[PDB]
Every structure is written in C-alpha cells, then in structure tokens.
C-alpha cells in the first residue's frame, strides 16, 4: 500500500503462500520488513545490518517476484457515460464500490469541483488511450483468451506473468493425445474414459524433457542417500497394492498339499511330515509378506535383496540328515529369487557345506573351505575360483557335485525386460539404460488364458525338477544307510515324487501373469525407482560404486578430479525369508475370477482418484527450477569462486561466507517450500554440505573397471531472469527503498529555511576538498581531559587534538569502539563544532514529518537513538521533516543535526491532491512521469522500454481461459 | 683521641633493606674482617689475609658498599628556629627525635664558639650564611621539595651514586594514560579503567625498556632448565588450573550414554570409559601444549595403540583407531599424519598392497619406530604412485590427509610499545596457533560443518563405514551388523558437542588474553604440515664466546624427535572433550568473562619479571666487564689494581665471586628465589651467547643478541681511582717495611718515622739473597755467616733483600733463624708488600709491655697463603709533655701516610706533647671560601664532607587500578 506498489489491489486473487512484501507508513518512519527479515548485527522494531545487506535485499526482491503467479480471469466490461469518457470501457466487476476501483484504476470519476492543477490536467488528457483497447477474442459467449486495457499498475508484473505463462503453457498439447501415453501406462488394458478434443486452451503443462527428469533423479538419489528405513513401509504399501490384486488362498491350501504330498516314515527315522509340520507352522492366520521380494525387484543397483540369517542352518552342513534336505530344497528354490550376484557361488558353497566330510576336492583358501558361511562371501574375489573354474572340480571325488554345478551352469533363470509409459511426454525412466527399458530378473512368457490352469512349463519348474533329481541321486547313498534305515529312503522318494508333482498355480502366474501386473502401476511410483543392467556370470561386470558429484575437490575446483572424492554409498542389504516363498511356489491357489481386462482395470480405477504423478511432475519441475536458480545466485553478488557480474557492491555489505550463504539459502528454501506448501526434502541435502563448489554428475563402474558417466543439465530459471532485470532497474530507484546512497554529515546546524537535509542547499556540505578537514582513517584513541586540555583524540599519527572542526571517519573504526565514541561526543557535536562525515555508503533511514510553525530540534536524543545500536551495525536514520508550504508561512527555528551527504529525496504518497494551491500542506504535484501517454499516444506499451521508460498505467492483459484440474479428467474404465 | 666514622647506613630514613655491609672497621676495634669477608675461603681466625687474592678480592669488597645505597628518599618538614649561632636559617625539620643533636651532626654552626677549641676557634671562622636550607624545588609535597639542596654534612659519593641511579630510574617512568592504553591492549580491549582525578606529579611508573633484556632472560632461563621437565610441568599445572578454573563450557560423556540409551558398541565404549571419572586436567594440558613448542613435543602412549599393531577384524582395534584418529590432529608431533597413515596400514597389512622404499621399514613396523624426517616415504610424498588397485582405500585416505588436515594461523598479542616483547624466531607481537581462528558471537548453536572438527568427524565416519561395508576386508564377520555398527557411526557423527565451538573461536580468545600474563613468555616453533625438508632440525645456542672459532653449545635437537620434550596424553579424556560439550544453559559470553577476569588481573606480578630481567642484564654486563678487569681472556683486558700484586686468573675464582654477587643481590631484593646460574649455566671464560635453528633442508636461521651499557662498572672506576689517588683510607697501604731493632725517644708513629732511620731498598750495605742462598755456620759455635751472590759469608746485619719467593715457602724457619738477631741486634731487611692490611696497638707513652711478643705472634700467624694486618703500638699525643719512651722498634713501614687522621686531642682544645692534628677545614672550603659552587671541580681531589643535598618528594605508587574484564 501507500506508496501503493504492494499487491492485493484490484485483481482476481486466488490463493497466497505468504509472499508478504509490503511497505511501511510514510507519514513517519518506513522499513516495510527489516525488523522482521534480517537483523544479524542490528536489533529493533526499527533496525537492520549492513554486514548482511545483500542477502536480505535480494531475498526481499525474490519473494516479491514469487507473490505474483495468480490466475487472471477477466469477466466483463461496459462502455461508460461520464463526461469524462468518450467510450473507454470500464471493467465490470461485482465488487463493492467498483466505482472507487475505477476512479482508482482510472483517473475517471474525478469531478469538476473547482479549478485545480489536477482538474486542469484532467480536462487536457486523452479520451482513448484509456480503458479497453484490444483482445484475443475468436470465440463466442466466452471472454477473449486475454484482454488488453489501459489500467494502472507496474508492467513488470505484466511481463512477470508473461514469462510465467511462457514457462507454463510451453507444455500443452491437444489433450486426448495423452490418452495414448495413459493407455501405454494403462498397458492398453486399463481402459480409459475421457472426452474427444484437440487443444481448447485448457493448458496441460506436463510435456516434460529428460533434463529435469534426470535432475530430479539426482536429487532423489541423495534424498534417498542413507535413509532406507523409509523404503520398507512403502514397499509394504506395494505389497498391499498387490494384495488388492492377488487371488491366492494360503493356509489350508498348503495344509492339504503337505498332508497329501509326503510319504510315510513314521517308524522310519524322523517322518518327513512331522518334521516339516514342526518346521513350517500351522499358524493359520493372515500371511501376506510374500510380496516383499517382488516389490523390491524395482531396485538392483539401488538395493540388495539378501536373505535372512536363520534361513540357513548353522551346522557346517553334512550328509546323514533330514532337516538338511528340507532346508537345502528350500534354498535351492529361494536363491533364484535373490538379486545378489554371488548367490550362484553362495548356493555352490552351500551344497559344499552339506558336502562337508564326504566328497572333498580342491579347496583354495581357509575361507573357500566348505565349512564357511556362503552368505559371508561378498566379493568376486570372495568366490571360490573353482566355482567359476569348473575344471578344478574333479568328477572323481565330487561326481554328484560336478553334476549339480554343471546343471546350474546350463540351468539357471535369466533376465528380460518390458516397456511402459512414454518419454514422448515424460522423459526417461532410468538413466543407466534406454528409456522405458524395464529389465527383469526373469524371462516373462506370454500368458493366453484368462483363467488359471495346470502346467509344468517354467524355468523354475525345471529347476525344481533338477533339484528333486539330485536329491534322489543322493539320499539313496550307501553312507545314508548306516546312518539310517532303508525303507526310509523308499518313503523318501515316495515323498519327493509328489513333491516335484505338487499342485501350484504359482509359477504360471509368476512367469506370465505377474510381469504385466508389475507393469500395471508402474510409473505411478512416488519415488521413481532405479535399476541397473543384469549380471548372471562374468564377475568383471560386478559394479564398483556410484559416485555422485555435486561439488568439487578440496584443492581442485574441477569436477573431473574430485570425482573420486565426491562419491556416496551404493546398495543396501535387505534380508528376507524363504518360508512364505516356497509356501507360495509349491502352491498357487487362484480362483478363475481375475478377468484381466475386467478385473484389474476394475481393481484400479477407484484407487485412481488423485494421480500423484501430477504432483510428482510439478514436484520435480519446480524442484529443478529452484536448483538452477540456486546454482546461479551462488555466483553473483554472493560470489562462490568465479567472479562474474556482481551488481550491488557499491552497497557495502560483508563478503561471502558459506555461513552467510547457508543463512540466505535457508530463507530461500523456506520461501520455496511455501510457494506450494512444499513439505519434503528440498535442497536440504544441498546445504547438507557446502553448495559452494557445485558440480553435478554421477557415475557407476564395474569389476572390469568400466566407468559410466551421466552429466545433468538445466535450462535456467525464469525467476532468475526477471529478478536480475528488476535488480538492474533498481539501482536508480533506491530512493524508494528507505536505503540511501552516500553518507551523512553530522553537526548541530540551525536553519529555518524549508529545505530537505535529503537535499540541503550547497553551502551546508563539506568534503575532503573542504579545508578544516581532520582526516581520520583507523587510528583514533582518545585521552580524557588533560591538565588544561579537554579529552583529546589520539590522531591517525598519534597526536592529541580537541573535539571540533571538520573531520572524516570511515565507519569500521567507529563500529570498533562505538561506546567510547558515543560517551564522548555528546556536547562537542551537539553543542560544539565537531562535524564529521561518518562514511557508510548505503544505509537505511526513516522519518517523521512536523509542523514547521514551532521550533525544531534534530537532536531529540538522536544520540540516544544511535547508542541503541551495536558495535556490530548501525541504526536506521530517523528524520523530522517540516511541512513546507507552497507559499507564505511564518518563521520558526530548526536545529538540525544530521543531513544527507547528497540529494536523494524521492519518495512520497500523495498529499493534497485536489487544489492548485494550499496554505502550508505537503507541496505535491501530480506525479507526471507515468501518464505522459495521457497527453500523447506513444511509448510502445509492450516493447522493452525500462528503465528508459517507466510508467504505472499501461498495457493490461487480464486473461480468461478454461482451467480444469487434471486429476478430474482422470476418468477410468474398470 | 678518636678517628673518623667513614660510614653510611646509620640514619635510615626508610625501612628498605640491602644487607650491604657499609661498616668501616675501627682501629680501637679490628680492621681485617672487612678484608676477611671477600672471595677468600682459606681464612680461619680474627686475623690474617691471603696475598695471592689481594687484588682479586678488592673488587667485590668495594662493590658491596655500593650495593647499599640505592634506597629511596622522602619528604622532610620545615624547622624555623634560631639561636645566636643559628640566627635566620630554615633548618630541615625532622619528625625524628634529638634531630637537633643530629643537626649539630649536620649543622656545624649549630654548636657555638664561646672559648678556645680547634672547633671553637675555626667555627668562629664559619659563617651562618652558607648553613642550613639552600634552595628548593617548586616541585614539592607537604613541607619538602621533590629535590631540595640544603647546606649539610654529606659525602659526594652517595650523591653521585643515587644521581646516576635516579637518572636510570626516571629514564623509565610511564604515563598512566598510555598505561591504561596498554592495559587495554593487554586486555585486548576487555579492561575498563579510567582516571578522572586530581593530578599528582610525585607519582612514578618507571618500567619502559627494550626487548634484548627479556630475550636474554628467556635464553638464560632455558639454559638453567638445561632440559629439565620438572621445571615446566608445574607451569602447565598452573595453566590447566586457571583454565579449568575459567572455562564455562561443560563436559558430559553421560550425554552420549543417553544418546546411546544404555561387544555391542555401547557396552564396548561403556567399559572403555569408566563412568566414574571426576578429573579433567591432562586434557587442558594437551591444550597448553600449543603455547610452547620450541622445547616440547606432544606425543601419545601406544597403550592406546593396538600394540602399535592392530588388525582388520578386532572390534576393539576399531574403537581404538577410531579414538586416536580423532584425538590426533591437534597434536604437535610433526610425524603424526603419516604415523596414523602407517598405523592404519599396519593393521591393514595383508589385504591392500602398496610399494615401499626401505627394507628396514616395514608396512607393519612400529610408527613409534618411525619418528624421523627420514622415516618419510616418497609414496606418502607421491600418491600418484598409488594405483587405485594397490590400495584405493589408502589412496583416498592420504588425500583426506592432504585436504582436511588442520592448518595454523596467528594473532597479535603483548604490549611491545613500552615494555617490549621477547621473540626471535618471530616478531615479538606475533602469536602462532597450530590451527586457524575465527570471529566472535558463538551464542548460536554449536553446529558447524565448516568446522574442521565436524569436518574431521564427518570424513572419519565416512572412511570407516566405507571400509567396514564390504564384509570381506573383515572376513569371519557373519551377522549383519551393518545396521548396528553403521547406524551407531551415524548417531555418533550426530552427537553435538559445544566444545569445538570453544576451540574454534573461544580458546583463541582465552589464550590471547593469557599471553601478556605470562611470567614466562612462550617458546614455540614455526608450524608447518608438509615439506620434511622445511621440517625444523636444530635448535642450537653457543654457550661459548664467539670471538674465537667456537662451536655452539650441544643441543638435544639431534637426539630428540625434532626439537621438543616428549609429552604423551590420554586419548580417552581428549576425545571425550571432543565428543561431549555443552555450554552453560543461560550463557552470555562477556559478563561471564568479565567476572572471571576481575580479581585475577586485580593481581599482577610481571613487574617482578621486569626488575628481575633488567637487573639481570645490567649484572651480567658489569660482570663480564669486571672480568675484563681481573685478568687475561681471549680478548684484550684492562686491570688496574695490578699495582696490588696478584697473579692471572682461574675460573673458580670468579665462580666464588659470581655466587657472591648472586647471593648478595638476592638478599638485597628479598627476591631470594634464584635468578642466575652464571657459569652454572655459562662457562668459565665465555663472552657471548647466540642462538640458531635450522630445518631438514638445511635452512638455518641464526640470531645474535646485543649489549647496552652499565654504569655500575663506571662508578666502580670512579671510586677506585679516587682511592687510587687518595689511598690508605680503609686498611690497606702501599709500600713496604723495614725490619730491625732501632729505638728512640723522639716520638712519632712508624707511619711517620723520620727518613733517617730508613734506607732505600738495596741501599749501600746491600745484602741480596736469592731463593738458593744457604748458610755457612760459624766455626766451633761461632757466628754463622751467609753466602753472597758472590759467595761472601756475612753475619746477620746490614740491609737485606727478600723480594718474595722463599719466605713465602719458608716462613717459620726464617722466623726461628732471625728472631734474636732482629730482637737484640741490627738486622735491617726490607720486605716487599705492595698493598697490604695493617693494624694498631693503643698504648700510653708512659708504660710498656713487650710488643715483640705480639709482633712475634703476628709473625707466627703467617702462611704463604696468608698475612695478618700488621699491628702498631700507637701512643698518646698530649697537651702536656710526659716521660718519653726508649721505644724499641722492630718493624716499620717504608713510607709516611695519612689514612684518616682527623684531629688531635679528641676534645682537648690544645695539644703540646706528641704530634698535632687540626681539622681538615680543607674539605669545607665553601665554609672557608664560599666562592665555590657545589658542582665545583674538586674530584678526584679531596672529598668534602659537607654539601647542599637535593631531597625528594616524588612518589612511587604500587601499580593497581579499578577495572572490569570482558564486559
């Protein structure tokens, strides 16, 4: 408000995030914020510090910028009937006293009381370059898509939103075109309801490139950096998603299956059912923790599916044993579920473990012994060479083992991939692979039937075949017999056959039905997952680490050398149990009820009510925009390490420090999060560490040393543009900001003339060129009184001089021993003729009017005002200003104390705007610097003419469109 | 009749003490005690004196008297009385009683002249106008000037002494203004002292000096230390005391406990810490290490090391290397970084493989065993050698070292403007710090990434976890504790200590404030972190004189690690302080430290250091000076009492003397705490010291001191020369003696024998005798006769010549041989003595008992290393004649003299019998001819014993104030 530049004036307000930038009351002091923004070395309802005086100001500017992204929706107009107008349209609004908002928006409705300079200029203006001019109206019954008109405001805001819109609309299309990519995410099988139409000016700004894609990735990649407690719950969220999809029945299923599939060994040394009953659980209740590994699949170079410890027995392995058989079966089943590349070697060593003491062949070291925990082995180098070096396996001592190893060699599941979605609109999916390439630990097979059926065609069914074969090969052993009974082994095979031939709709749904159902979500992932190309063999591909730079090295400002230094943990262990796994594999129980097209798309749509990707896309976009705006500002006033255009340093503000930088960046991040009430990790990982040497990229390397760079890139910040523009323009309007260029001259002067100390008559100032200069830099001590001499200052050479004259002082010396200085100077500047140019550069000030008719003192303990300040900063300058008359007024004294070293008096809200003359009131004339147009039609309104031409009543384009929420146009078909 | 009381220190105007024996030894009493209180150590009785040290002792002798007189003068009131002989005089009123008797003592015309007496008669010639108060200073306190000359009995000796004294003193006074300015700088702007008052010009602040003095003092201090720990350990003690006494920050390991929420890591550390400890000192001492470097080295035990070995699988070793790795970088031992590097390597030896550069070196060898610049490996000096497959872990580690390693700084300190500051390997006001500092207002939470300390915790947590992750560098590790251990690493990396803040910006302040308070200033070394060749190697000094080709004094720099005394610390307490840190819960920096400061600086002791050092340098100055006056050194010397025979010098001579001085002055200042070990830190015949220090490169930096004058030896020359023109005055005479039995009734003293009963040495009737001259005995018991240089056998009589070599070595024989011959017959031998003590024997001219008894005694009491002062039976002059004496002379001086003959007939106004002596009215010439001023030219001529003597009302205040600390 007055001087009204602040928002909430007449516009179509829609919602705020507290970008509160405003003014302060002008008839008195004026700070508008800075007893609330930054008071680092000052403290008051009336203070600010010049040792952080560049952050605060920018910050103030930036929030201002933020305040102005609101939705323009112009509604209706009408020709007018004042004598004042000759057809200029009024904007018709239902608002109360729209008339005042017009007499305000336009100088209209301003009558003919008596001859006033105002009224005179009124009678002279134009009847045309006023009100409506033009618009983009090609439709019927609905407003122009935008309307231009001559109304009062600052066209930055106009151009501001021009660039705002530019950033927005750039991503629109004919909508239904996106029904493609949705159907591609619908897999073509989640049928879709939506209208049929091309672009109808309903902006759908979600056509996005891979730049911001990858950038947001990076951000997540350290946002996820070292926090995996959070990954578990949402993984369960996915598990329940699947629960809402999977038809399985668990407890009595396996109950009947097991009571049917085992063979009789009750009087035959540990009956298998009894043992296995006591092992599994009759724990009949909700059990759904199976979906775990399935959902975890979404990450491989990200997470490491490891198996729980107790899943393995703790006996070093042996032959004559039944629980060995149980558990070895279980693991042979579950290991092909793991992501760990040593899992082959792991099971290898595992069978070696139960092969402790009977079959014994080449052993490499004291760890590759068959007595060592397989899971403990970690590195390619931790893998028994012989495992990968099959010829060390003599088929003589380990015939069965060589057998089985070769089985695994030729027989082992393999990876595949699948597609989803569209970079066409939405950029990459992962960055260490081509777009939408979704590699798979499995090799999906095409399902055809819409209902479950029995069949044994599956790589894992084949594996089960292999393992039952090996088991029968072994249990019948002649070393078993002495440890056992013989009809026992008969019943053993009697079990294993029904085992390998047990009922299970699992593997078919897995190999065929699961994969598409995985693809069902499956960008609809709050965190977009990541994965890395697969590895089945050939240790040389075993990755090393994903090093991420977001800065440089200590002594090396280059990224390409700090690469080894700026690098972060990779992979996490996540231990799982095989029980429910085998439970499911050996028993799939699916009713013929999931009518895929019907069932699944049915299960989905109601869930589809608030599609997050919308929030995700905007999230990431604004994210990267912020990040860019940052990487720019850190190089400006606020240098980082590379001197490029700093602008305001003619303002003295203290130099760069990460501490100061971190402070400012906090203010930023704050404002940012507000901008849409953002609430998640945001640049929080960047001030985590120094965002001063910022250099972004990432890489991963493998056992073959093969390195793989990914280097991000950002297209800039529309904000940063506008803000720099305005910043430059500012340099000449500083007056409008309660901060002044120059210094002040201080000594008790006594005048009655009506003159601003903001522009005092020439006679009153002095300089170095002035004689009487007592020049002081940074050597000034002070003696108290002497024998006959008063307190005398030790001089810059070291001499003692009394306190009066023309003296010069650079501020820092002052801020040093302020207290000393102040306790001394009281009289001899107040009463004495001590006058110093204390030299500040650029500084806050403040004011109060006053009636000149009485005497005026500009002491009023302005000293007291001073001493209130710290030895660390300076108090804003209050001023008493007379009410000068346009003509006669009587004489009264005025004892001033402080004056501006310059003329800078330019700031005023209107006072006495109705008269060609007034007795003594604020001498004010219509500010004729913005409406010269109203006397002559010129000044290309939209052409860039600032600061060369700055007005406040301009080209005005209130918009009007069709603004549907995109969550709403999400109509599903079940 | 009596003689003159040549004295001082008999009318003390003060209670100050010197303990400097200004007694003169009387003649009715004994005399040679003053000649048996010198460097002589072989004396045993009332009587006797060594010939060979005669000259050699006089120095100290005359010196001590001087040491009596630097006392301080004060006001005296105003007396106004007049009597006929005292008409119109402003006598100096004295608060003391019988001061009028003391006036007659100082006022001659005080007494009158009503009759006949050498007093009455000559005082009848004395005026009343050159008596009493002469002239005054307009500068004056009470009833006396700050300098007021007044006619009075006095010795110009004391005058000159205190005059040059005063000169020095006032040459030092300091303005309270610049004083408080100092105190400000001393307080670094954290004192508050003003002074609006009524001025007083008596006030005295004489303490302004240069730097060379303190620098010398620091040198000698180190020398006396001679590398003794017990010297400076208690220094560190006082330090830690005041430190723990002053720091508001609080430590609480129990915090972590809750942070951990009480092996499992927690159990391990809980056993590691003993949750009972209550004492907090040696850590503070680890800090105070940063204050002195040039002599000491912070080191660490290896009981903290994993046997200085370690492995890659011992969880305890994890704890310990963790612990240390944190507690290290703050040390001063320069081999630290590569040492921790190599220790880490040793524990790791076997998984990662790196080239070496010495077979005796071992990648598993002891870091302790590697403690030289030569223990540096060029692979640690070039990482590019480390292929990232050799040991990438260690490569990254070495780079971490190259990068985050601590980095020194400095600050201003001291008040060199007036008192100066002593620093040689650095400018005086420069104060290093092995780390870097930052500005104030830490009243914000203590979190700081940019803190090299948080930096440290961060980087170490990283490298640790990074390594621990693989499970394979650590085989045998089965249960997944990547959860427990690594989350623990997180929690600890997330433990907040306010200590690092104190360290980063507060400790700098504390120590900068301590700096001026040092009764012993620092001694440190230019800190570096790299370039072994730059690494210092030598801290040498030359306890030997420089004027000859002279290697410096042996230094331990080649046997210690670099230069410094070892110092092993506790990693536990240190790293805990690094770990748990909390400031007072309501703290406001300044007011806290204001109150913490006040009473401390309310006390002050550095002025003791000043007095110490100034006296020290003056003392050694005049010391080596007098050395240049005693005998021959490696430079031309000038002796002056060589007219008093004594040989050239040995060392223990001055040694005795040196400690004479040390004792004397310590007793003279009641600062009996020892100051100097002159040769006990120096060398019998040295002239100068000089320091030097060099790096491993061979870059040497070699400093030499400078000398100012010392008026002491000057005034010594002053005094002696006057005595060396006015002799006898104190018990020693030049000349010789003639020995033989002559008798007379014409009365005189053997000091004034007529030159008739005398003969020149080697007179006609000559009888020369060398060392080898042996006797021809008489025949059948006849008179033996002695062989001549020609051979002739002459009897025991004539004029005989013994310069001296043999009588020294053949005393008692000679006595027994020549006794009766001198006793009853002529045997006139001249014996050569040069300068020598004498004695008297009071006797009446009317009676006699044999002096030859006591004479023979004095003979018996001589050794070649000892001579007693010769007694002489002294008669009574009279105002009336009496029965003369046949007096039997045996031995007599060879000369006429006056030592102190004042005046005959102590109170008898006239004298007839015996000699006469009037008053040396000579000395009071202004009292005879007042044409003369007091600075008239009469020196080194006759001394006057009456003067106008400036007396003073200046005042020295004990240096204090009323102030406040950090506001």
Residue numbers in the entry:
A (entry chain A): 302 to 1275
B (entry chain B): 301 to 562, 571 to 1275
Question: Could you give the paper's own sentences about this structure?
Answer:
The particles harbour 10-separate genome segments and comprise two principle protein layers, the innermost composed of 120 copies of protein λ1 clamped together by 150 copies of σ2 (viral polymerases, λ3, are attached inside adjacent to the icosahedral fivefold axes). The outer layer consists of 600 copies each of μ1 and σ3. The array of μ1 and σ3 is interrupted at the fivefold axes by pentameric λ2 turrets which enzymatically cap the mRNA transcripts produced by the polymerase on egress from the particle. Here we demonstrate that vitrification of infected cells followed by cryo-focussed ion beam (cryo-FIB) milling and cryo-electron tomography (cryo-ET) allows high resolution reconstruction of assembly intermediates of a mammalian reovirus, allowing atomic models to be constructed which throw light on some of these fundamental questions.
Unexpectedly, numerous star shaped particles were observed in the virus factories in addition to particles consistent with the expected virion architecture. For stars, analysis focused on the fivefold regions using emClarity16 yielded a reconstruction at 6.6 Å. Broad features of the organisation of the molecules parallel the arrangement seen in the virus—five copies of λ1 (termed A molecules) cluster around each fivefold axis and five further copies of λ1 (termed B), orientated in a similar fashion to the A molecules, are located 35 Å further from the fivefold. Since the 60 copies each of the A and B molecules account for the large majority of the density for these particles we henceforth term them single-layered particles (SLPs). The maximum diameter of the SLPs is very similar to the corresponding layer of virion-like particles, however whilst the latter are roughly spherical the SLP is collapsed inwards at the icosahedral fivefolds by 100 Å, to give the characteristic star shaped cross-section. Superposition of equivalent λ1 molecules between the virion-like particles and SLPs shows that the majority of the movement is caused by molecules A and B tipping inwards by ~35°. There are also significant conformational changes within the molecules, the largest being a hinge-like flexing of two parts of the subunit (the same hinge is used to adjust between the A and B conformations in the virus particles). The molecules rotate by some 35° and slide partially over each other like the blades of a camera iris. Overall the λ1 protein structure allows it to occupy two radically different configurations in the SLP/virion-like particle, but is likely not compatible with stable intermediate structures. The interior volume of the SLP is 59% of that of the virion-like particle, thus the dsRNA genome segments cannot fit inside (the dsRNA in the core of the Reoviridae is already at a concentration of ~410 mg/ml5).
